[PDB]
Design a protein around this nucleic acid. Structure first.
Lengths: 200, 180, 122, 131
RNA sequence: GGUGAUGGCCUACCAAGGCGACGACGGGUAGCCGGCCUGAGAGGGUGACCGGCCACACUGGGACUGAGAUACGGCCCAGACUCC
RNA sequence: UGUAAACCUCUUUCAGCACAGACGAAGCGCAAGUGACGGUAUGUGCAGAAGAAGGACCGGCCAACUACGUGCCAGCAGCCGCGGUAAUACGUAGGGUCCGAGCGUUGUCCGGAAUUACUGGGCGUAAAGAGCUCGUAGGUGGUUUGUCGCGUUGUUCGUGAAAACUCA
RNA sequence: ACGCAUUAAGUACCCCGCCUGGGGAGUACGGCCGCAAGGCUAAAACUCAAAGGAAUUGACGGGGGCCCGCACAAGCGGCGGAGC
């Protein structure tokens, strides 16, 4: 199940802007509620918890899914934080957002869910699909001409794409080399606290 | 950049003819995160004053930890008062795994990945002293080699040698990035 | 102890104290009350706690607390008992589930409703 | 009575090292001589010499002390004692201080350091830990 | 003597032996395992599904046929219960 | 509360309605047929944000607080304990936190418990040295030579069903 | 912690006895021994959220030591009796 509630709310609480370009965070940087102005006693559990909240509420994953991802990454031979971030960046929704066809992660989630994409010729309408090496992501014809997709693709002068993603043609084709490393994820926040929380 | 943590604020009392006189105690750990740590215990009539005394005491009593890049050299077992703490080196990317007081001392000293467990006397101050004793018990490979008069090849294992190489490489790369 | 003393005697575990014996390996049991009455708590506290003396399907007589502010239960009505500890009552080890069998979900309840068996408003 | 001569060796060494003595005199045995050979090779003791006493030979070991008064031995603990004897496979050789210490293992080829036994592929009974 | 087979398995005679604190004989409980859950590991708990063995077919005895029988939907007897 | 909403644009996964519609069958069969699942899975079309969120918790452990209502009453509670007219602990509100087709309670086991301590505990005063000896079984054993290869160690072969666990 | 400190409660090896929260309880039942008194072996239900050790600061003592104050002792004058 997805989360539908307001988005700037969670950025407000967590102290970090997630979408990035909203005005509500700047005009209200403090946490919500009647007592969002109250001074708050510090706690290592609070730190580690809020870190996970930023990660999960930036990517869209739920707690069960994220815990499974963490267990997978801990099982992986690499450093647990790096394996975490590269696994959560292998998601189709994140890849689509990163390639520029989605103005936001919610855009990418819905646009993948309604089956506007196709990887290696198969109609993949699931956001949690994990992109592997050497995958070619194309769009279908019915979605190629639709007004919002067209607007986003034609006006796409926003944030630069990373190295391993590459858009190459005017048809909005996506091609991937490799799974990112800790330099190339370059999402905010920190991984050690994420690992320690689940190590508790 | 000194990193300070305050693990225990305890309200302590002495009784006189009129009644109870109350004072506060603070156990403060001061560290830079680069391998230099020191524990301070201060007491005063108010929390901020006790905190200042603890910080000054900790800065007065400093102490160096024999890290290997990120983790400590070898497993050890510290004992102070009735507190017992075991420390075990961890692999890169593990993170600090320890209780409250032990985690505070351990992360102020600059250790990132280490396994730690307290085996008695859950009192915070005694666990801190046990951790300090365990850290004092650590030895560097160069010093062990000098102590028994052998070259580093016959003292430390190959795994520690490669870890030393990689830690030196990271230090040099960061120094090059900073200088230019 | 020496290793030979161990190969001679061995280490024996602490014996487990069986808790909530009347349930007889069951999560809940369907009982029937003998009395409905109030009972005074300990020294530090002071109230008038409502309990019931239930004859259980396990062929055991137990006293069970009745949570909530208002209960319809009168003497000898069918109930569904549950495990639970209350300090104030020294000899009470079980709780009566609100919203099962004859027990009515408490009235005017709006918060933490599922614990008290009250349906959702409209 | 005297049941563990090797543990007697180790505790005499430990007590003398803690009291900062320079020489240590023992009744002599071939096993003790071999253990002293290993300790000398690994740099823990300076030198050892056997001398003749009224009722037999005697082991005298000279202790090694650092120029800043530091001791060359940090610990000395026995492992396989009468009663509970410890035997180790080649793939389970014990490591002391993450390998910074030395474990002396009796093997069919003789007394060997754990590094030596892991290199040669043999295993045996672990006698003591030195660090 | 018996059995497919060795054997107090059974029988006649002869000898007086055999098992026991490294717990006989009793009492209580329980199908056993591959595995499952937990735990850093050792260990602790457990034997749901799937798979291999074992035991049983209302209770208690018995044999027949057969290469092969606890013979669930076979036989004989004695019981308790249901029906004509 | 809250970019939340109202409003302007937009895509419509999944359900709804239509048409098409399998693999499972290098199979059976000397017959012409042979799929129970099933007209399902699955494809291609139309309609429009339209048919779709709740549950615990918010004194400390333990992420998350203010107002009103009863004042040792009513009630809460996993432990310390909260209620005695100005309660962040009761009830209701707002607000918040955690999860989300689930959320809580009970029961049972493991963990935390180094709290049966082999790894890995103890016995002067905290629980714990028999009132003291002798001695049976048992456990344990000083220096050294030779032999055996039982313990120990190395290598090879067979076995350790499949499923399970872990890596690809 | 008090303290132990070659006569260890220090560093070590071997063997034995014992402990696993406080009550209930060294009690009940069973057994052995005893003339008896009783001893030895030795639980469970129920109940408590502690029971404890060492040391600190006060308070207290029909504990000690050193001091004072119309406190006593040495004196003067009263109150308690009467009316207001």
């Amino acid at each position: 199940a997805r989360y539908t509630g307001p988005a700037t709310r969670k950025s407000r609480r967590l102290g970090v802007d997630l979408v990035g370009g909203d005005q509500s965070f700047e005009k209200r940087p403090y946490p919500p509620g009647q007592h969002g102005r109250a001074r708050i006693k510090e706690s290592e559990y609070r730190q580690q918890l809020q870190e996970k909240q930023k990660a999960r509420f930036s990517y869209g994953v739920m707690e069960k899914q994220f815990r499974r991802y963490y267990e997978e990454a801990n099982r992986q031979p690499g450093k647990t934080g790096d394996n975490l971030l590269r696994i959560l960046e292998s998601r189709l929704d994140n890849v689509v957002y990163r390639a520029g066809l989605a103005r936001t992660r919610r855009m990418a989630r819905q646009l993948v869910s309604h089956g506007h994409f196709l990887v290696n010729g198969v109609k993949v309408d699931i956001p949690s699909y994990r992109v592997s090496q050497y995958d070619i992501i194309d769009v279908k014809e019915k979605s190629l001409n639709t007004l919002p997709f067209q607007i986003a693709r034609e006006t796409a002068g926003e944030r630069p794409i990373p190295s391993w993603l590459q858009v190459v043609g005017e048809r909005q084709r996506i091609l991937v080399h490799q799974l990112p490393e800790r330099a190339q994820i370059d999402v905010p926040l920190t991984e050690q606290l994420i690992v320690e929380l689940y190590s508790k | 950049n000194y990193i300070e943590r305050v693990v225990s604020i305890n309200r302590v009392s002495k009784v006189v003819k009129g009644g109870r006189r109350f004072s506060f105690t603070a156990l403060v750990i001061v560290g830079d995160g680069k391998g230099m740590v020191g524990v301070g215990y201060g007491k005063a009539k108010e929390v901020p004053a006790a905190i200042a005394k603890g910080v000054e005491e900790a800065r007065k009593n400093f102490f160096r930890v024999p890290l290997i890049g990120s983790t400590i050299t070898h497993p050890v077992q510290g004992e102070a008062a009735a507190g017992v703490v075991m420390l075990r080196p961890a692999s890169p990317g593990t993170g600090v795994i320890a209780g409250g007081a032990a985690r505070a001392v351990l992360e102020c000293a600059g250790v990132h990945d280490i396994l730690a467990k307290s085996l008695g006397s859950d009192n915070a101050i005694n666990v801190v002293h046990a951790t300090v004793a365990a850290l004092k018990l650590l030895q560097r490979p160069e010093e062990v080699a000098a102590r028994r008069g052998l070259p580093i090849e016959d003292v430390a294992p190959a795994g520690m040698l490669k870890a030393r190489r990689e830690s030196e490489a990271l230090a040099a790369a960061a120094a090059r990035e900073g200088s230019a | 102890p020496t290793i030979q003393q161990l190969v001679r005697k061995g280490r024996r575990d602490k014996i487990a104290k069986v808790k909530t014996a009347a349930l007889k390996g069951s999560p809940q049991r369907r009982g029937v009350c003998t009395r409905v009455y109030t009972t005074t708590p300990k020294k530090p506290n002071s109230a008038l706690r409502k309990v019931a003396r239930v004859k259980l399907t396990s062929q055991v007589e137990v006293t069970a607390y009745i949570p909530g502010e208002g209960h319809n239960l009168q003497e000898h009505s069918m109930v569904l008992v549950r495990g639970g500890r209350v300090k104030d009552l020294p000899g009470v080890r079980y709780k009566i589930i609100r919203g099962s069998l004859d027990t009515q979900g408490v009235k005017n309840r709006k918060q933490a409703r599922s614990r008290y068996g009250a349906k959702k408003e409209k | 009575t005297m049941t563990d001569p090797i543990a007697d060796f180790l505790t005499r060494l430990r007590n003398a090292n803690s009291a900062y003595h320079d020489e240590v005199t023992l009744p002599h045995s071939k096993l003790k001589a071999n253990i002293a050979e290993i300790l000398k090779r690994e740099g823990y003791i300076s030198d050892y010499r056997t001398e003749d006493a009224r009722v037999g030979k005697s082991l005298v070991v000279q202790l090694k002390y650092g120029p800043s008064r530091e001791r060359s031995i940090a610990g000395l603990r026995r492992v396989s004692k009468p009663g509970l004897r410890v035997y180790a496979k080649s793939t389970n050789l014990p490591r002391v201080l993450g390998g910074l210490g030395v474990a002396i293992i009796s093997t069919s080829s003789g007394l060997l350091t754990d590094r030596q036994a892991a290199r040669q592929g043999v295993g045996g009974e672990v006698l003591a830990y030195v660090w």
